[PDB]
Amino acid sequence: REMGSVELLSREGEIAIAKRIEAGRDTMIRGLCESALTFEAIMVWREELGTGRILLREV
DNA sequence: AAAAAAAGAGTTGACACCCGGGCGAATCCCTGCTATAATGGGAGCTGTCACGGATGC
C-alpha cells in the first residue's frame, strides 16, 4: 500500500535520473579537487610510483 | 662347627614404534558480474457455546 500510494512509473524519467546522477558526480569531483587538502594528501601516494604496485592500475 | 649363588635389584646400551608437526597438493567457499522488453499476491475459515471482559456514542 505504501509503495503504491506514493510511487509511479516513468519511461524517460530514468534518463533524467541518470543525467542528475552524472551531474552530481561531476559536481562532487569538481568540489573534491582542492589544494593543500587532497592534492598534497594523494601526492604522498603518487610519489611511491615507479614500482607498479598501486600507482598504476590501482589509483 | 663354616661359606658362596638362583633370584632380586639396578642399570646399560639396542631397537620398534607411534602419533605430532611440518611440507606439500589438491581442492572448497565467497564474491561479483551477466545488458532486447519484463513493473501490486494466495490460502483461510464460515457445522460448539458460554463466559468474561475490552472498546464506541
Residues 8-47 of A with CB under 7 A from strand B: 9
CA gap A59, A56 in Å, rounded: 6
Method for this entry: cryo-EM
The residue written with cell numbers 579537487 in the block is A33
Give rounded-to-5 percent helix, strand, coil for chain A.
55, 0, 45
A2 strand B contact, CB < 7 Å: no
How many Å separate Cα A54 from the centre of its chain?
A: 20
Q: What amino acid is encoded at A46 in this protein?
A: R
Name the nt closest to A3 by C-alpha to C1'.
B40
Alpha-carbon dihedral sign for residues A19, A20, A26, A29: negative
